[PDB]
Design a protein around this nucleic acid. Structure first.
Ligand SMILES: [Mg+2]
Ligand SMILES: [Mg+2]
Ligand SMILES: [Mg+2]
Ligand SMILES: [Mg+2]
Ligand SMILES: [Mg+2]
Ligand SMILES: [Mg+2]
Ligand SMILES: [Mg+2]
Ligand SMILES: [Mg+2]
Ligand SMILES: [Mg+2]
Ligand SMILES: [Mg+2]
Ligand SMILES: [Mg+2]
Ligand SMILES: [Mg+2]
Ligand SMILES: [Mg+2]
Ligand SMILES: [Mg+2]
Ligand SMILES: [Mg+2]
Ligand SMILES: [Mg+2]
Ligand SMILES: [Mg+2]
Ligand SMILES: [Mg+2]
Ligand SMILES: [Mg+2]
Ligand SMILES: [Mg+2]
Ligand SMILES: [Mg+2]
Ligand SMILES: [Mg+2]
Ligand SMILES: [Mg+2]
Ligand SMILES: [Mg+2]
Ligand SMILES: [Mg+2]
Ligand SMILES: [Mg+2]
Ligand SMILES: [Mg+2]
Ligand SMILES: [Mg+2]
Ligand SMILES: [Mg+2]
Ligand SMILES: [Mg+2]
Ligand SMILES: [Mg+2]
Ligand SMILES: [Mg+2]
Ligand SMILES: [Mg+2]
Ligand SMILES: [Mg+2]
Ligand SMILES: [Mg+2]
Ligand SMILES: [Mg+2]
Ligand SMILES: [Mg+2]
Ligand SMILES: [Mg+2]
Ligand SMILES: [Mg+2]
Ligand SMILES: [Mg+2]
Ligand SMILES: [Mg+2]
Ligand SMILES: [Mg+2]
Ligand SMILES: [Mg+2]
Ligand SMILES: [Mg+2]
Ligand SMILES: [Mg+2]
Ligand SMILES: [Mg+2]
Ligand SMILES: [Mg+2]
Ligand SMILES: [Mg+2]
Ligand SMILES: [Mg+2]
Ligand SMILES: [Mg+2]
Ligand SMILES: [Mg+2]
Ligand SMILES: [Mg+2]
Ligand SMILES: [Mg+2]
Ligand SMILES: [Mg+2]
Ligand SMILES: [Mg+2]
Ligand SMILES: [Mg+2]
Ligand SMILES: [Mg+2]
Lengths: 158, 134, 259
RNA sequence: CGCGACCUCAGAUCAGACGUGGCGACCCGCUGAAUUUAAGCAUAUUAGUCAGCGGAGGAGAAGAAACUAACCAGGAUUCCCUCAGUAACGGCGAGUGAACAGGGAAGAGCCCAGCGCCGAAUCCCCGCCCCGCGGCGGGGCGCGGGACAUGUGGCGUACGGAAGACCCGCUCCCCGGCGCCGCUCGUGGGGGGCCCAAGUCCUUCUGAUCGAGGCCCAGCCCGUGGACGGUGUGAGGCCGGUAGCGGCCCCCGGCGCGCCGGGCCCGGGUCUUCCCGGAGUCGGGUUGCUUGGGAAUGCAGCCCAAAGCGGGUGGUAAACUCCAUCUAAGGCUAAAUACCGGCACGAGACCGAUAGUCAACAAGUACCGUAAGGGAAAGUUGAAAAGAACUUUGAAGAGAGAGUUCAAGAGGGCGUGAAACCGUUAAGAGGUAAACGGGUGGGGUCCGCGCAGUCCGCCCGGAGGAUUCAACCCGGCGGCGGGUCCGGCCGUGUCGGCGGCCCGGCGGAUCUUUCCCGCGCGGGGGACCGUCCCCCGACCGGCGACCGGCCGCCGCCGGGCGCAUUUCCA
RNA sequence: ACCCACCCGACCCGUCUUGAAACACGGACCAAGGAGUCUAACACGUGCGCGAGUCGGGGGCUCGCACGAAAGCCGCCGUGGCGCAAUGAAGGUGAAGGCCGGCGCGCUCGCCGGCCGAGGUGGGAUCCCGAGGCCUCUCCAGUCCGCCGAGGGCGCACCACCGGCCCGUCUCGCCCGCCGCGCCGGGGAGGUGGAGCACGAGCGCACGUGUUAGGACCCGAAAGAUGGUGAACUAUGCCUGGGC
RNA sequence: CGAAAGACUAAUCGAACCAUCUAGUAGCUGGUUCCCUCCGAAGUUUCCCUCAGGAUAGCUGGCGCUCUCGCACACGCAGUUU
RNA sequence: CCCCGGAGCCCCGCGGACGCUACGCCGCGACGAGUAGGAGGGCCGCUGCGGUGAGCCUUGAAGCCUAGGGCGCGGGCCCGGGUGGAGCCGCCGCAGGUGCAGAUCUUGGUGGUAGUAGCAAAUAUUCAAACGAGAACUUUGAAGGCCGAAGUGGAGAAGGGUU
RNA sequence: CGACUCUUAGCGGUGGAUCACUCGGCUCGUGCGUCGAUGAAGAACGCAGCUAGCUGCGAGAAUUAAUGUGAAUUGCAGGACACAUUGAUCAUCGACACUUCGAACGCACUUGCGGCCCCGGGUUCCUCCCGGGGCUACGCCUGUCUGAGCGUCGCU
């Protein structure tokens, strides 16, 4: 029964909720586990960025977010076509590619081509064998860095 | 402290480990120090006590400077019986009184081949550590 | 306490009319446990009233500035010999109270060195008093791996472990902190404010970079400064018998007019 | 009335394979209540919840848009935070209740049918040889069988694809083995084994010490080891361990190099000519369940039942109309995620034997019930069994002595041993049941005395003894306080240096792209402003923030002062 | 404080009840056990930190965690929450006024320059000014220090009242605007609905009380539902035997 | 199942027994654990499928705040009376 | 018409308690019933945690018992003696499965009732001996009785499970 | 004084509270994440020199082998062993073994009845008889063999 003034309030504890309470005593143990697993994955992908692949710049949807810009899922095909990277290869050099992205405006396209161009400049493709063929960079830019890149690769700053 | 996160430091766990210990493991638990004399000679602190070592009792009632030969090792009872360490029961019969190995000192070892190789292994590890410390 | 604790029986009440007492009683059988008393918080067997749960709100989370304020407060009173002595630490013969030292002390790799240091600095008599305190705990925590108890010793704030934290380790009483990762649980143990510490010049320099002086930001904790003071002249005895104030007070009526 | 193809079907203890039951914490598919709430109750709620059935895996399920949106647009699934107790549902009552965006954890994408081209270019099983054989594989050779054109394999799947011509640039990827090299993060991966510091030092307590005092620096020695346990009490140093990028030995993994056996002649852009999509499905009607989904969110049965610039979606039914957005009716896929079952560990501000699991113990035991099922009680001699030899009374159980033990005022259900209740011993009482409150008395029990308790302490006066000094200077040390702020260090407010300003850094939506570097933007200079630091002078708060001299005062030590002083004692 | 005596007083507690010593219930005695908990949500109060902000989660970076599943830090420091703005069902709209001078006819209406800038009344702790005393060992002069202070002021918070502004709504009216002159858009006056504005008070953490949802202070139904076990008793049928 | 008594169905029958949903619900019985101190009620209101209960007023406590002046220098208020 | 490092002081403004844990200390008035209920303070009490007591403890901890000595209004507390034989407490903070006379409360134990009710269905026992520590009850012998072949006899079924 | 009753205390009983211990629980976390026709889980019955229960094992039955370890096991016996030797005793566990029911498999649940191949006694393949051994569940797939049909054809 209500007594003199207060929010006529509806709690949702009518089902058997104590049967499905989910505690968080994991979380520290979890946080570590992720972190180990993270450091392992770095070490496996030895000079490759820990991050992942490079990802496009992309505007959010809706009037609300609109003004901001994130990393997207992957670079469109037009953006790869214009940059001149064969889509099947782009995956092999650490360039995210989605193929479901349309491309409406040319301002978002040329920006994302520029991204890939810049990436290709500051990328150090190792040759397949220690014996060096084409494409593969010099042993100077190799000895001076077989270095991983900490954090997201070429980060987007709005 | 102990930092190894697979050891135990848990009364109940250590005691259970102890009392329900298997024979070969008890051998190690039932170890006893060498006399300073042997400590000098072999480069070994202590040794797993055995059926017919010569031994002094260091503490208790039977604490004394006599050197009694070991009689048997009752690993179930965590104890060793020693030559003249005994007590007359009600009806005259002598009964070998138990002494815990660690409250005893080995003056003379019973050296077999295996005991010889053990002492060679312990002395070598001791001198490796002194070389590492230096 | 376990969920099933107390309810693993199947027990119905013999209703009224049997004399007895309307409790659920164990059902059937030819044992002692039959027609007993199940479930009730009062019964043997039974079920504790409001069995304890795991999702009691164990952890407790504190505003970050407040945490810092405490840690500044503890530091500030690690000065002040009175507050250090009152917190028990035998700091009688120590040379200077915010005790800062050479930075070879990063070097040491052996307790030998670390103890010798503490004896020259006259901080050993705290460690000595730690040994003296080592005794058996009172009661049930004895049988739950809290069997021995003792004093807290000298804190030792270092800037970098170059070997130090190995050296001071077996010396009972000592806790080692990084400067860059200070902790109020250790600087104010018991929630009690004083505590004799021992600084390393590298670390003791770094404090102002960590906490920021009054006219400079932290420069290491993004957006932070010291907490400002509410009153500046703390010694009110210096205030109250000033010229300025005693000039302006009526003369103290102090006769005692008894009945 | 034969023999032979195939088709559809049988039978074999035919050859060789698989499936069956279990477990069930987590997971997938069905099925599905009612207590309950609504202060009654029927819709609602409880709840797609319990019980029921089915099937799994180390996870499962989901998943590469017939998606979101309506933006300047995002771009598989899962998970968290948020959205949000919101939009919505609801006897619009009780109550119930999502999604997108946004930020994270993770991150990975693919394959068919079809349409087409390629002598079925494909697959399975036989049998002979060489290797390899405890996850039946490679290579070769057989007019040795069969599957297959009612369609196997290569190319290829919407992100387009194929075939053609010339623009370009050049040719490592995989597996079956056989070796060999570096033992490859808790700082030598995983498993096993066996190892590694220092007191039983001196006294002393004790039944026994691991105690208490000491030991070239809180005492000796180690300390990368003062976790824990054990050992006749409380142990860094007695023992096991503990610490350590410590050691050795096994085995196994994982990755590096060499050789062999095979396979494998595997691109890209540019222009032309062709090629292109899953039907009793979508969709509609419907009835029933379901959903926040409301003129139908999703799933169903039944009836109708399609199209190809089609189809689906675009959260209010319909018609017209533009836009946007996917491409359904076939399939595979690690990861972040779950885990009251299992194996193996670690920990605790938990419980400490009526608690904590039913269960510390020969517990799912005994015991009960025809059966489904129900389900207890119960830990502790002692350091050591040293568990009471022997004598004696008794048929014996039981005693009495003796002995063991530090103790049996620890005697095998024995640590401690409360209360109820009982026996006795001592004291006291007693016809209104006892017991009680208040108030005295009497007696007991002990406790404090006194064999004067006249209790102490100051100061003084006296008479007796007693050693040395106060007072006084002198020499030394230490302390305080002071102003002349005297001299110098110290710091507050102000002014002067524009002096740190570039030899002072950060911050800024201040400016400049006259600059530099990298691609109009990023980074760095360069101006500018705000903030923080050097130089000296002046004024002032001269501040417990200190030094140095000088002064005054105090105290201590040492000198002197021998007795109208000086303490002591009675 | 043990016992005994005597005088006076004196019914057995718990509980429900207008009323219990009750011929009202519970209670032979002792031991141990035994009932307002925890989570979530709200509100108010209080304490602390920061303050037009605040915030910490969730995530991440720092360690093998001995103490650590802590502690620290983060252009994540703010995605986001709450807060800093309302009001309307909604499309939407959205908290300023005054004064002065000029120009439109000052038309209590429309447009252009200057100044002030959150209105005013009453009461308001408190500050501020202060005539004037009141003396000083003498007659006057006379700066310094108070004590009081009649009288007069600025007036916090808060309260009451009157003005004003914003949104909804009505009534009455007259003008402005332009890429689109329109069933376009904008304003004015006067009422009246709003959980509004009128120089901000919140955010986070902690404790307390209260109120709820949960087993929800502890014990208690008759019932309801799902899935299983029993016809060894007994009820009836049938088969095969026995008995009078 | 009943030659019918609601009989019998393992000492249980006007719906057996076992386990679970289940700690089912209870406006109703019962109980509800230490001391001192200070304040101290109500059984009346209106509404209720309300009359053995709630709601709402009332009566209680707690926390306060804002002012007042015995610091020779007071305004307001009342279970009165004039 | 002079200075307290000296007026000698009932007031002393030069410096200030024996007193001043300022959550302290002190003075004046007034008042004090209390269920339900509310609030405050508890150097009241229980168990565990961080601090802290150079705490206590085999030269005797906890518990237990006490016609011993005291304190407190009280919750309670402290000492003496006994018993016991290994751990335990004070202070400052934090935490809670924190205080019992009741619940026809739960589990265990113990009384009064009480040496009481009771050991009465179915006719029946007696003598001697043996064994034996011991005989109303065993065994043997003798006598007297009953079941009276629809049996208190002689054999099975089911059920028991070594009787 | 007498007995009895009441009260207090001493000592003794009864009883098992309290306190102190704890090879057990309860909770939180970590890693791994493995059963079965090659017979699972579960049940049964067995097995020790003296052993009933718990445990441990399977007719090789408180265990065999192997490897590691290096003198015990022990309630009492007895023994072994040369503990200068594959070597006691534990641990590991890779080889071996694993009675009967049970998905449970020749068919039945009596522990009853069988069939079919081979072997030893029995014969001198004489079938009997006895003993041993190996097969003999259902479903399903790929093949194989034998077939069936006024199913669709062809040739004769
Ligand atoms: Mg990432
Ligand atoms: Mg329990
Ligand atoms: Mg205790
Ligand atoms: Mg299965
Ligand atoms: Mg209802
Ligand atoms: Mg109800
Ligand atoms: Mg009803
Ligand atoms: Mg529902
Ligand atoms: Mg279920
Ligand atoms: Mg899957
Ligand atoms: Mg799909
Ligand atoms: Mg999405
Ligand atoms: Mg919200
Ligand atoms: Mg629902
Ligand atoms: Mg094809
Ligand atoms: Mg010990
Ligand atoms: Mg130790
Ligand atoms: Mg050692
Ligand atoms: Mg529904
Ligand atoms: Mg619409
Ligand atoms: Mg799938
Ligand atoms: Mg027990
Ligand atoms: Mg017990
Ligand atoms: Mg128990
Ligand atoms: Mg006990
Ligand atoms: Mg006992
Ligand atoms: Mg006990
Ligand atoms: Mg004793
Ligand atoms: Mg005893
Ligand atoms: Mg006893
Ligand atoms: Mg004991
Ligand atoms: Mg008497
Ligand atoms: Mg009533
Ligand atoms: Mg009545
Ligand atoms: Mg009464
Ligand atoms: Mg009456
Ligand atoms: Mg009643
Ligand atoms: Mg009664
Ligand atoms: Mg109790
Ligand atoms: Mg508040
Ligand atoms: Mg309220
Ligand atoms: Mg509640
Ligand atoms: Mg109930
Ligand atoms: Mg019903
Ligand atoms: Mg019924
Ligand atoms: Mg209840
Ligand atoms: Mg009622
Ligand atoms: Mg009051
Ligand atoms: Mg009172
Ligand atoms: Mg009360
Ligand atoms: Mg003991
Ligand atoms: Mg607790
Ligand atoms: Mg009681
Ligand atoms: Mg009688
Ligand atoms: Mg017979
Ligand atoms: Mg007595
Ligand atoms: Mg017991």
């Amino acid at each position: 029964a209500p007594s003199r003034n207060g929010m006529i309030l509806k709690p949702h504890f009518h089902k058997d909720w104590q049967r499905r309470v989910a505690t968080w005593f994991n979380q520290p143990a979890r946080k570590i586990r992720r972190r180990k697993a993270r450091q392992a994955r770095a070490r496996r992908i030895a000079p490759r960025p820990a991050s992942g692949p490079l990802r496009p710049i992309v505007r959010c949807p809706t009037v609300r977010y609109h003004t901001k810009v994130r990393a997207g899922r992957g670079f469109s095909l037009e953006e790869l076509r214009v940059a001149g990277i064969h889509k099947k290869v782009a995956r092999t050099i650490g360039i995210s590619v989605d193929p479901r992205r349309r491309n409406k405006s040319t301002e978002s396209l040329q920006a994302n081509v520029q991204r890939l161009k810049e990436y290709r400049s500051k990328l150090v493709l190792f040759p397949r064998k220690p014996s060096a063929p084409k494409k593969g960079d010099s042993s100077a830019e190799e000895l001076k860095l077989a270095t991983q890149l900490t954090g997201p690769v070429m980060p987007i700053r709005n | 402290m102990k930092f190894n996160p697979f050891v135990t430091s848990d009364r109940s766990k250590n005691r259970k480990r102890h009392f329900n210990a298997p024979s070969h493991i008890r051998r190690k638990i039932m170890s006893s120090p060498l006399s300073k004399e042997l400590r000098q000679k072999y480069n070994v602190r202590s040794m797993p006590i055995r059926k017919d070592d010569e031994v002094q009792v260091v503490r208790g009632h039977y604490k004394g400077q006599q050197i009694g030969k070991v009689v048997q090792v009752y690993r179930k009872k965590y104890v060793i019986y020693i030559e003249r360490v005994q007590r007359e029961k009600a009806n005259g019969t002598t009964v070998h009184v138990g002494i815990h190995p660690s409250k005893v000192v080995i003056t003379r070892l019973k050296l077999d081949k295996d005991r010889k190789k053990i002492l060679e292994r312990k002395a070598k590890s001791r001198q490796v550590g002194k070389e590492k410390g230096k | 306490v376990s969920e099933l604790a107390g309810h693993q029986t199947s027990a119905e009440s013999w209703g009224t009319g049997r004399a007895v007492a309307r409790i659920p009683r164990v059902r059937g059988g030819g044992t002692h446990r039959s027609g007993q008393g199940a479930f009730g918080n009062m019964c043997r067997g039974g079920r504790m009233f409001a069995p304890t749960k795991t999702w009691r709100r164990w952890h407790r989370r504190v505003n970050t500035t407040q945490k810092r304020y405490a840690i500044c407060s503890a530091l500030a009173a690690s000065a002040l010999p009175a507050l250090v002595m009152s917190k028990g630490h035998r700091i009688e013969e120590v040379p200077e109270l915010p005790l800062v030292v050479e930075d070879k002390v990063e070097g040491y790799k052996k307790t030998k060195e670390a103890v010798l240091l503490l004896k020259k600095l006259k901080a050993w008599n705290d460690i000595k008093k730690v040994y003296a305190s080592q005794r058996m705990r009172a009661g049930k925590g004895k049988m739950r791996n809290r069997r021995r108890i003792q004093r807290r010793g000298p804190c030792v704030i270092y800037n970098e472990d170059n070997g130090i934290v190995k050296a001071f380790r077996n010396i009972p009483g000592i806790t080692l902190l990084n400067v860059t990762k200070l902790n109020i649980l250790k600087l104010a143990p018991g929630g009690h404010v004083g505590r004799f510490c021992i600084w390393t010049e590298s670390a003791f320099r770094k404090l102002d970079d960590l906490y920021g002086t009054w006219r400079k930001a932290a420069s290491l904790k993004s957006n932070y400064n010291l907490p400002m003071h509410k009153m500046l002249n703390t010694d009110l005895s210096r205030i109250l018998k000033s010229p300025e104030i005693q000039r302006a007070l009526r003369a103290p009526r102090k006769k005692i007019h008894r009945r």
